Write a protein that binds this ligand. Structure first.
Ligand SMILES: Nc1ncnc2c1ncn2[C@@H]1O[C@H](COP(=O)(O)OP(=O)(O)OP(=O)(O)O)[C@@H](O)[C@H]1O
Ligand SMILES: [Mg+2]
Length: 121
């Protein structure tokens, strides 16, 4: 749980390209991925990816993922794409998946779900 926090000490949100920020590749757990948009997966195309990760996990780049926080610091990870890439990782029963984190705002989520957008907390 986390019924407490530090405090304000740096305008991170709306920060210009000189304030402070760290965006890089990160292994985000598969159990905390948010995907509210089903898709049609192909069993032959997943096999090709499952073969790359099993034959060479270095020639496989990360996917783009949006990093947004709720009204209570609750971090939520949204993914839109790499659908087939998720099946290969999910099929290999792996614990986490490489994904590029990109700080975003609830507005960016409205562009994708400007209708079924929930209330993050
Ligand atoms: N054996 C392989 N089979 C298919 N794609 C491969 C293979 N090895 C490398 N790749 C790369 O994996 C990437 C697959 O993910 P990408 O995000 O690019 O596109 P996508 O097919 O639209 O699907 P999703 O968003 O569902 O993963 C491709 O860009 C391709 O270049
Ligand atoms: Mg495409």
């Amino acid at each position: 749980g986390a019924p407490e926090g530090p405090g304000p000490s740096g305008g991170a949100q709306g920060g210009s390209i000189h304030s402070g920020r760290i965006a890089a590749v990160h292994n985000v757990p598969l159990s905390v991925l948010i995907r509210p948009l089903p898709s049609v997966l192909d069993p032959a195309k997943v096999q090709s990816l499952v073969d790359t990760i099993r034959e060479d996990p270095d020639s496989v780049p990360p996917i783009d993922v949006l990093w947004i926080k709720g009204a209570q610091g609750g971090d939520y990870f949204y993914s839109f794409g790499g659908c087939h890439r998720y099946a290969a990782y999910q099929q290999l029963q792996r614990e986490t998946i490489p994904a590029k984190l990109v700080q975003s705002t609830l507005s960016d989520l409205r562009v994708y779900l400007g209708a079924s957008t929930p209330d993050l907390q």
